[PDB]
Amino acid sequence: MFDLLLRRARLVDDTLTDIAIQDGKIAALGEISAPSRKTIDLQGNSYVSAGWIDSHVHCYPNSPIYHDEPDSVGIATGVTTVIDAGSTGADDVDDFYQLTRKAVTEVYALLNISRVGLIAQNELANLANIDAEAVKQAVQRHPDFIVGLKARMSSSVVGENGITPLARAKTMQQENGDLPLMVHIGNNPPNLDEIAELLSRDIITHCYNGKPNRILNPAGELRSSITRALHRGVRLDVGHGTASFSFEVARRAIALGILPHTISSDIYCRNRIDGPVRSLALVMSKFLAIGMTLPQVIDCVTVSAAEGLRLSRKGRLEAGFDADLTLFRLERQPTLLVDAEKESLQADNILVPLAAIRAGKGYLTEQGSAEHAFDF
Numbered sequence: 001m002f003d004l005l006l007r008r009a010r011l012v013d014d015t016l017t018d019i020a021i022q023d024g025k026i027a028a029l030g031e032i033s034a035p036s037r038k039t040i041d042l043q044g045n046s047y048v049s050a051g052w053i054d055s056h057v058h059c060y061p062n063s064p065i066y067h068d069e070p071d072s073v074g075i076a077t078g079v080t081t082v083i084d085a086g087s088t089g090a091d092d093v094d095d096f097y098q099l100t101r102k103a104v105t106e107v108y109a110l111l112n113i114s115r116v117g118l119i120a121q122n123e124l125a126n127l128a129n130i131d132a133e134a135v136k137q138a139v140q141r142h143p144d145f146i147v148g149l150k151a152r153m154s155s156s157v158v159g160e161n162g163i164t165p166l167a168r169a170k171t172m173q174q175e176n177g178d179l180p181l182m183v184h185i186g187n188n189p190p191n192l193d194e195i196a197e198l199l200s201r202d203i204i205t206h207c208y209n210g211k212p213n214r215i216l217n218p219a220g221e222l223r224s225s226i227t228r229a230l231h232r233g234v235r236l237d238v239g240h241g242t243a244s245f246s247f248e249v250a251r252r253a254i255a256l257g258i259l260p261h262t263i264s265s266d267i268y269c270r271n272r273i274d275g276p277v278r279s280l281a282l283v284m285s286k287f288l289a290i291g292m293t294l295p296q297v298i299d300c301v302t303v304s305a306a307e308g309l310r311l312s313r314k315g316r317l318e319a320g321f322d323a324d325l326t327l328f329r330l331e332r333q334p335t336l337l338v339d340a341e342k343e344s345l346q347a348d349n350i351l352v353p354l355a356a357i358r359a360g361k362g363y364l365t366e367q368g369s370a371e372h373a374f375d376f
Ligand SMILES: [Zn+2]
Pocket: 152, 184, 185, 206
């Protein structure tokens, strides 16, 4: 007998289907007649996808500048897994882990290659903080919480070390079971060519920034280093953020056939409440407005995100996987979407998350409670 049954759900290809959940796992999809302890009829008026994954957040509550609560950036916005993008290094990762034990959202962390994390804005300026043994110990200590490494390779972070930290990060990668490595880009030095040459089958975030280390050359074409990196299997993550997303860069790259592998927000409390990010749903909506299809955007926050961070039981609406689901609507609601270059774009439709299902347990969002429709 099922724990939860969603009837007449709409998949992102617009087909109607039923989704049965048993013991925190997806039990079945399709036409379902077996009994359930709880049944919800979505009446064809809400999409259901695998639980959204935000591959680039800052949800360490004690981080001095880029802080947020995991559940404020997770379930409250329909997102069932968040991945902290190196807010902590080895110095603060234990406290981070202990605080996240209570979160309803599934929280994983990318470990900053610098021991001090985002305690300071120049964490790669001192090579002594880029400590391999500290990271080895941290990884051994939290083998399931830490899912990869973070290196912010830009001018204000490396100080006078240039490209040397990325080399270290690569070495560090090798020493820890070849964990995924997320590389932030923006201002130079180092140059984009030098950074991308060091990467291999690795994730470049802020992939549509309008800073000098943008993936487009001044002629409006893709940098050849980025073409070869993509050839080698390097992936692009959006990591919108406060200053890392340009509508014009993204439009041009998307016209060149260079779509993001994953969409992510680079969200923290300030750009959620005040800044141009607001939520993963709104970032996704910006990519819908640029012209990507709904299946593509949803893939960018589910199966592709789970593959890129090796989250084996997340991101897939398949029998036997974790019962993390997002229930949402594409609502006609004229809205101004603002990028990091302060450029506005009028959009007619936006994604509105209505509920997050986590381990088979439902949680309405604010909008989900307002619209009523269904309850858990
Ligand atoms: Zn960054």
